[PDB]
Amino acid sequence: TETIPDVRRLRALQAEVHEELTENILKFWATRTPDPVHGGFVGRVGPDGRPHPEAPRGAILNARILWTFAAAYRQLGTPLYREMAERAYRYFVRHFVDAEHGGVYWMVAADGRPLDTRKHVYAQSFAIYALSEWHRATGGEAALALARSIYDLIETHCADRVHGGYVEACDRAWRPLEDARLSAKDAPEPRSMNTHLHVLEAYANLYRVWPETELAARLQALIELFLRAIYHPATGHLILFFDERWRPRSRAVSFGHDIEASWLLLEAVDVLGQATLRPRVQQASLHLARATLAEGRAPDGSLYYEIGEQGHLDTDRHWWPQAEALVGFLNAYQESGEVLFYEAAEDVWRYIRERQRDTRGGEWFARVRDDGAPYPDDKVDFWKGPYHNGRACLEAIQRLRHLLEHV
């Protein structure tokens, strides 16, 4: 009694996603961004497509490059992707990893000198995520050892054992900082959904390759924290910021984070095999997906950016909520069998192809205005890597593969 798109549509979508990933996204990243002056990858590519090999380089961006090429190599086998992942890994271990205090710096100069040595848990998480993926792709001993060491440092220096969750930022020597903001956009609050979501993402990937008993407990605790404190059943949205006891300190809504968490939370419970927790997670996941469907979309099926603290709807289409909606809506279809979620995934894909991707300049525009005008944002910067859209394509390809095997 399944309602399933026919084989032609499934395969056509899967082929388009594969083409987008390999002939647009990963081609852009492998050709435009490697830096032969300092090694590794440039920190910025302007709106005109010009790379900036002297720009400062973010740990999150470089972890995202490593993760994406590692994952693409694992799933597709293309040798260039292993080469690019190795390139990212080598620069990462050389320069971003703090050999003295452990963990990864926030920002290095292009030549590798530390510039911002804070140890932000969000960056530590992306390091774990990328290093565990590189281990998954290669069996790399050192990659896994490094991921485990960063996990240990997060638990040792940042875990709030009274209230759950984590202090989100420390200085180089792991002393907590008051200002845990990722950027000026973020509320000056001690706890954020965003950082905790990516701890969960990292821990789930680490557990997949290293099923340590204590890590399972920490990951389950994070799932339970989302269910009890962050997910808001009255509205179907994640609460974004909190004090240390998880009292809400924001009313903003992030549609992209809702739909990302919708599928990441289920990936996390399934990595654990926690069948007892899964019904509650699936319920919250489907709720987040329905709330996104009903409240976060433009009539073309693309996702708006946010409802701000004053209630203003930011109608800009940022690139990464569209990517996360592609995966999250496909995932919601897989979980519920409700083909309306597949229709929604198809609609966001069509928007990605017709508006968000930059056919002339390559990759995807960071932002498209409500009237269709692409903003002249950088194509690559501290916050724009290949991970959201690369992962989204890889996820969709594999999910469509599974759906194709239902026949």
Q: Which residues contact Cl ion by CB under 5 A? A: 64, 385, 387-388
Q: How far is CA 41 from CA 24, 47, 254, 266, in A?
A: 18, 17, 30, 32
> Closest distance between Cl ion and the C-beta of residue 221, in Å?
27
Phi, psi of 191 (to 5 degrees): -135, 140
Other Cβ atoms within 10 Å of 360 Cβ, number: 6
Determine the Cα–Cα distance for residues 131 and 65; give it in Å rounded to an integer.
11
CB 85 within 8 A of CB 137: yes
The side-by-side arrangement of strands in the sheet containing 57-58 is 57-58, 107-108, 114-116
Determine the Cα–Cα distance for residues 93 and 72; give it in Å rounded to an integer.
20
Which CB atom, from 73 or from 231, has the smaller least distance to Cl ion?
73
Which CB atom, from 40 or from 385, has the smaller least distance to Cl ion?
385
> Closest distance between Cl ion and the C-beta of residue 33, in Å?
12
Which CB atom, from 57 or from 64, has the smaller least distance to Cl ion?
64
**Given the DSSP bridges, would you call strands 317-318 and 57-58 parallel, antiparallel or unpaired?**
unpaired
Which CB atom, from 197 or from 239, has the smaller least distance to Cl ion?
197
- Cite the beta strand spans of 56-102 per DSSP E: 57-58
> What is the dihedral sign for C-alpha 335, 321, 58, 77?
positive
Three-state DSSP class for residue 95: helix
Which tokens hold the place of 226?
């989302």
Which CB atom, from 218 or from 388, has the smaller least distance to Cl ion?
388
Which CB atom, from 151 or from 382, has the smaller least distance to Cl ion?
382
The 8-class DSSP code of residue 299 comes to: T
Report the DSSP beta bridge partners of residue 367.
Answer: 318
Which CB atom, from 223 or from 264, has the smaller least distance to Cl ion?
264
Q: Identify the helix (H) or strand (E) that includes residue 237.
A: strand 237-238
